[PDB]
Amino acid sequence: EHVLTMLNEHEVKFVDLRFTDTKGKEQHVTIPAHQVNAEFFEEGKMFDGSSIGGWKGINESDMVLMPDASTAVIDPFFADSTLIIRCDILEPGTLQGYDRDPRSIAKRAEDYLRATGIADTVLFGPEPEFFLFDDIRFGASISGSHVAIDDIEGAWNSSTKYEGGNKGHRPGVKGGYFPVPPVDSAQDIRSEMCLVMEQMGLVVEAHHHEVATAGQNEVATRFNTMTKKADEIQIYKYVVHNVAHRFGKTATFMPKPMFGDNGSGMHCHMSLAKNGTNLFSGDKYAGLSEQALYYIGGVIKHAKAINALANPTTNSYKRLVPGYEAPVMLAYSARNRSASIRIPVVASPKARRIEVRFPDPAANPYLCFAALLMAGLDGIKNKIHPGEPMDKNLYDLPPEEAKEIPQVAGSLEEALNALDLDREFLKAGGVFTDEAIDAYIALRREEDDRVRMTPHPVEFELYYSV
Amino acid sequence: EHVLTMLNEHEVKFVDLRFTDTKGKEQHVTIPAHQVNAEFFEEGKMFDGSSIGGWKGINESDMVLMPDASTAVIDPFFADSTLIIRCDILEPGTLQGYDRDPRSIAKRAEDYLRATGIADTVLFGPEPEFFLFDDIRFGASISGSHVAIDDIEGAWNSSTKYEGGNKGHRPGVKGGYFPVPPVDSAQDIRSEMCLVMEQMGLVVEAHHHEVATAGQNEVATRFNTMTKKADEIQIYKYVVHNVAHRFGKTATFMPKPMFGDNGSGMHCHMSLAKNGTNLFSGDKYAGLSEQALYYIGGVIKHAKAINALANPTTNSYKRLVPGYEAPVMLAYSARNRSASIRIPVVASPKARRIEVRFPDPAANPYLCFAALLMAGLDGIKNKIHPGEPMDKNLYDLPPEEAKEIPQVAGSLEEALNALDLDREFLKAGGVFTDEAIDAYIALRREEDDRVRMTPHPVEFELYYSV
Amino acid sequence: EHVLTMLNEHEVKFVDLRFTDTKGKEQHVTIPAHQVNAEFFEEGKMFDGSSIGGWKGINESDMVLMPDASTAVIDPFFADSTLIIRCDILEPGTLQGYDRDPRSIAKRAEDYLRATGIADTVLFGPEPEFFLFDDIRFGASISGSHVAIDDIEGAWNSSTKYEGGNKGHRPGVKGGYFPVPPVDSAQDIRSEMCLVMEQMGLVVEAHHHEVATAGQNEVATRFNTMTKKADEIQIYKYVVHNVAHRFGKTATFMPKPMFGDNGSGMHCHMSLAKNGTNLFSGDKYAGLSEQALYYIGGVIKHAKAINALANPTTNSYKRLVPGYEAPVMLAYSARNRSASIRIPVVASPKARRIEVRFPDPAANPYLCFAALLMAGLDGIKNKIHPGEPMDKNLYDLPPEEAKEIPQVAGSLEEALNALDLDREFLKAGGVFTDEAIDAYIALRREEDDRVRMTPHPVEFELYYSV
């Protein structure tokens, strides 16, 4: 009913139905507002399943788009007044919730949480970073391939001739952390993104330029319950992509667009709760509950499999490389930023939580968050102890005992394989089905293949004169 | 009278008289509003027949334009207020309805339906798809020929240098199914098309980007009675073409503009009715009446001849090729999307119908719809049983029994020849005359010849070094 | 031994081993002269079969290259002295003669001729025509396709600006038949081709410019026994291609490179003989033997199947179109140049023969000639009477009885299908195996598909605004 009044209040002409595919990309279809009736909400609208990658095959194409009336929000970019309504994908007749629908999967995972009685709500606070460029060009054909990035902030443009003169105040390599404008050219744009994000229901905590030259930026938003947060991530990306477009830029959430400067990560802060109390505060290490520790143990035990969802691109592994600040060591600490799991030191026990650092923004919200949870729960159910916190150092020196302690997957294939083998913790509660998992893996292997099979420019530098 | 009041209400300065030629192209002529009087409606206006392709020859040029007052609608693009009035082409004196007038032919077919008493109204719900480009160039002369397509969405432009930078968020090949903007660059335009379509009497159900890269799009409209729907198709195309033009684009309803990506089809949903009840619902397969099955049998029996009207271009056959999703297998099913006849699975028996998938948007509304009907009726009158539904697979593997089951025509010539031989079902009720059919065939053979006789670029690749 | 002396006489450094693939394209591999020993001639050299299209598959790759010492001839273009030796492809161990080797097939056919005792030698006098251009450009990708032809003789260049001025004496469209230079710009080149052809063993009868503008030309060579003539065709093409290249031109034997002007044909004059007497001279029509007539009957009966070898490209059918001089009517005559079979009127009965006009230069020598023979023999063995000679007119007016008399295939697919069904006459004597035929058909269907599936530039002209 709230929806039917929003239609009149904003004189809506269209309703934009949205959903996410397996890869994590928001999709949409539009219907005139006059097509929204009572039926619409109880039985949804029909659409072809076979069209989305990794979904229904040759025989069972048709499926249901079920509008979730709680998600109604006005689109701030479209020319004609239109209302966005996120939808779940349900199996026809049964109206159950498609095994391969990432939002259904995430909901199932929140259900299973309540069911085990371990807690009643999961809290996710992801920190996606991104880049804002002016020009992005790439291609690949039989005779070669290339990628060219360009932005007014790129340090390389210190020598570029410009029509009205080079005004040259640019962030150097790894020198983007906070120079005030004009070095930072994105203040106005970061704020528009903030205002718009809030007009769309998100709550912004801060915004700032990130480390890399050439437009790395970040908008920090307040956490929320798992599934609602993944929804927020989708909106977040949408706002970022579109505000950038409107400003004459182009944004990307790729994890490592440039060799030699910062990649973009999506740290995930998590904590559990029951009847308003934070199940993660306690007397153990850094203010943690023993539940938190088991959770951590779970995440560490299933890290490589989580990688397949939290770092789902070959590019993801160009960020997760033996570097200093590389969040690749499977350990926890409240200081050592070598550890992929940081423990925020905060006063109020109400805010005690863990920060899993290896995820990147390419990750499917839904599936990434879900896999993080399930690993945590399995860590609890099986009281998987974390061991002791690493407070020493990262991957380089150490190099004492060859420092072969836990680490995240080193390639996408490896992560996919881990997901293959270590799938039980995900199938728990019937959240993830084998079919879903196998389909996801197949989609990504096809991507992994393109990169493995196509000659790399660097290979010419290294081997043309062989 | 309603017309004469619309003239005053909108301060109309002109009346744009419209009609369609044999090929399916809407035509027009304009007269000042002050030329609209009582006479106009009862006796129409005179015009030269010999000017339209495939119409009157050397001796009998003059014919009548009969305004159909029910079709009055304001043109939303012209600068000066003008009212559009669709017209039928009548033989002078007799005022009968020209044998070769596609609208008259379609009306005759609706009449014959009522006459046989099989039903009192036919329902058509076509789904024309189309492409929106930025640049289209082509030519052919003695020294060569070419065609060049270009659009900001084309995947090939991932490498193109642009004045203000390449913002690069483009739908990859076969990757247009629903990425939200900015990947989908046509939201605003699809909605203007919707709003305008509705201002012109159409009822829109949905709009979305289609599968192909480079601007394939679709506006779904509500079905209507056969002849009124063909009228709607013409308006639909008009709106699409002109809104595109106003937005700096160029739209085409060609069936296969690009090799390697989706073509554009025009699926046709059909059903019959009498005194408000759906003659297609029943206890037989998937909720069908035995009448529906005979109809299907008719369509299948006369498929190749229908092709000559539903796929009237050589280009049409570049879409209908042994592909996976190619709607080329003459069979029905509620799932197998290899079958050119899908049976929508819907709850309300009031909405039971069949979907003939092989038609393309190049088809003349009128003649295509009519041929579909006549084939259906002949399927009924002669209780032509469908056989059993194909629920196995498409054209490739199968490949067991060489899988030579029914198929649609494989070339325009073949389709024209089928139409030649299998014309009886069309002549039924005096709907289609031999002269009309022979004239249509002659028009298309001339087109078929251009393509058969002109060297193809690929022939050089294949045989220049022979 | 003659070969071993040619090696010393010309101080040969290399031996270029040549052969032809199924499509008809000459192939080669080179070995130092010092690799030529006694063994070489008796056991040949080994090579990978799987590399040539339509040959050995996954398991049986290796085959034998058997040098035919009778074919030794010096290459007139290579920089270092090299001797060309044509080779047959033999099955290893058995040393039989590969079923799919076109030269072996042609030899088998000459054998079968002698075996039936019908005659002891077959005489072939083909007349391949060709084009000489300056620039040829073409391509096809997802966004389009094109072909651009250019030559200093092209009539279209009457308006072109040239660096040193346009000297403008060019052959107009269809106006190339014999204007003396400078209109004819290829006298010097046609003669070099002649001299070189003769240095390579061919005997030249004449050379002249052909009908089409833009460099159509022809070098007429003396007939020879079937297999030796096909060898000559290969050499002929080689000389043409390479002399053109050396003169800064580019030659093509494609049958119809331009719409609107002459295509290139390869008329085939044939006759049979026994113990020096011409089995084709007689008292019947135009000086023919009844044997000749049965031969003609055979050719006419199996025309469509022969087409698959004599007109093996989709392009071939752009030459064979209802035109005036189009050699498409399956009939004979000594005058009517509408007839695909002309009977040369000559005095000496020693020179009596038939001229089958529909072949084009794209045809595989071997397979085309062989198919022509086998059809002729089957015409004899089964005394297939020709019927009466057509002396009336071609395809247009006539148009009396709709003039549906015999005609050659109208498309490649049709020809391939005919070859499929009408294969018996080819399998006779074990000359053609089913496997060979099926493989050939598969190679060409793949080619036919490219053309059928790729949008044609003309389709845009005809249907973009549909």
Author numbering:
A (entry chain L), B (entry chain G), C (entry chain A): 3 to 468
Please give sentences taken from the publication describing this entry.
By fusing monomeric MBP to dodecameric GS and progressively deleting residues in the junction, we generated a series of MBP-GS constructs that assembled as chimeric particles sufficiently large for cryo-EM analysis. GS forms a dodecamer with 6-fold dihedral (D6) symmetry and possesses a sterically accessible N-terminus. MBP is composed of two (N- and C-terminal) globular domains, each consisting of a central β-sheet flanked on both sides by 2 or 3 parallel helices. These observations are consistent with chimeric particles having a central double ring of GS subunits sandwiched between two rings of MBP subunits, confirming the successful scaffolding of the monomeric target.
The side view for Δ2 is characterized by two distinct features within each MBP layer, whereas that of Δ5 shows three such features. These observations suggest a configuration in which the MBP and GS subunits of construct Δ2 are approximately aligned along the (6-fold) axial direction, such that adjacent rings of MBP and GS subunits stack with an eclipsed geometry. To obtain a higher resolution cryo-EM structure for MBP-GS construct Δ2 we collected a larger dataset, used an electron-counting direct detection camera and performed 3D classification. Inspection of the junction region shows a continuous tube of density between the C-terminus of MBP and the N-terminus of GS, suggesting the formation of a single helix spanning these subunits. Strikingly, the observed position of the C-terminal MBP helix deviates significantly from that predicted by extending the N-terminal GS helix with ideal geometry. Distortion of the intersubunit helix relieves the steric overlap and permits favourable contacts between MBP and GS, which stabilize the MBP orientation and thereby extend the D6 symmetry from the scaffold to the target. For one construct (Δ2), the 12 MBP subunits within the particle adopt the same orientation relative to the GS subunits to which they are fused.
